[PDB]
From a paper:
Previously A4V has been crystallised in P212121 and P21 space groups that have provided insight into the destabilisation of the A4V dimer but in contrast to other mutants, no compound has ever been seen in A4V. To exclude the effect of differences imposed by crystal packing, the crystal structure of A4V SOD1 in C2 form was used to compare monomer-monomer orientation. All dimers in the asymmetric unit (ASU) of each structure were overlaid onto one dimer of the A4V SOD1 structure without ligands. The average RMSD of three dimers in the ASU of the A4V SOD1 structure is 0.19 Å. The major difference is in loop VI, residues 109–114, which is more open in the compound-bound A4V structures with some variations among structures and an asymmetry of this loop between two monomers. The result suggests that loop VI is slightly displaced upon ligand binding. Binding of the ligands to A4V SOD1 does not seem to affect hydrogen bonding and hydrophobic interactions between two monomers of the dimer or the distances between residues at the dimer interface except the distances between loop VI when comparing to the C2 A4V SOD1 structure. We note there is a structural variability across A4V SOD1 structures which is not eliminated by crystallisation and whether the subtle changes in the compound-bound A4V SOD1 structures are related to the dimer stability requires further investigation.
Author numbering:
A (entry chain C), B (entry chain A): 1 to 153
The structure:
């Protein structure tokens, strides 16, 4: 198996730890952990292209998109590789994350190791917002916290 | 050409940005940048195994050592893959870093992408201190700042 981890930090109070694990190459990736300090409700949750934190979350670049598609939800055929949809923060501002995704990988030429996981200010509209911003970012707004995706024990 | 970047942060005042670039998969890696907030003199400078910041720099684990060798300087035949030796901080606490290393790689089975770069409290004795600690860590002492090695534009 490949096991990786991401520590999410930003300019504000949002912080979290997200685990990724893949049992076999181009097999499904389990993504799980916890994020705290989020406003109650849905938050966009994406892998961005660059593991570059030189200008905070801004230098991570756009959603990881090596197949040059439009933004969508994780269940859509038309999506970015990095499109993991939303996570849900409870009334205490805690998002318990548990996702299974078959498009991201921890191996091969489109591997997300050394890229950036970002949790966003607002809900990802999954490309259903009726504008160019919807088909690029899902209107998920600002980057609250991010981390570079790193190899774990 | 693979280009990667590492933002070094820690508990205290030490911070920096280190770039890595490799033209070909066989080839040397250029390592360069700047670290500030250091004591004047030599500081151990190592790639550690895990890109895991869950318990700060401690969760990075030991020096990256896929060939199960003893600690050395970068020029020693016996070294860890992660053994990049010392960087030098000037009297203002700034280390200008410029290293070329042919043992680390930014691709292949022993890639350092998603691993951790650490700058240490004291000088690396390059595995020549005549104790067990020398053969593991070079007696470079505590981890002042670290970052996950990420993909850059
Ligand atoms: Zn997207
Ligand atoms: Zn070593």
């Amino acid at each position: 198996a490949t096991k990786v981890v991401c520590v999410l930090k930003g300019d504000g109070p949002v912080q979290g730890i997200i685990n990724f694990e893949q049992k076999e190459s181009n097999g499904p990736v389990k993504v799980w952990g916890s994020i705290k300090g989020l406003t109650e409700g849905l938050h966009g949750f994406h892998v961005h292209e660059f593991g570059d934190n030189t200008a905070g979350c801004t230098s991570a670049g756009p959603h990881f998109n090596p197949l040059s598609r439009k933004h969508g939800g994780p269940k859509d055929e038309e999506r970015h590789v990095g499109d993991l949809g939303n996570v849900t923060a409870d009334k205490d501002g805690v998002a318990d994350v548990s996702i299974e995704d078959s498009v991201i990988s921890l191996s091969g030429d489109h591997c997300i190791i050394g890229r950036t996981l970002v949790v966003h200010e607002k809900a990802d509209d999954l490309g259903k917002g009726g504008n160019e911003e919807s088909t690029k970012t899902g209107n998920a707004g600002s980057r609250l916290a991010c981390g570079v995706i790193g190899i774990a024990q």
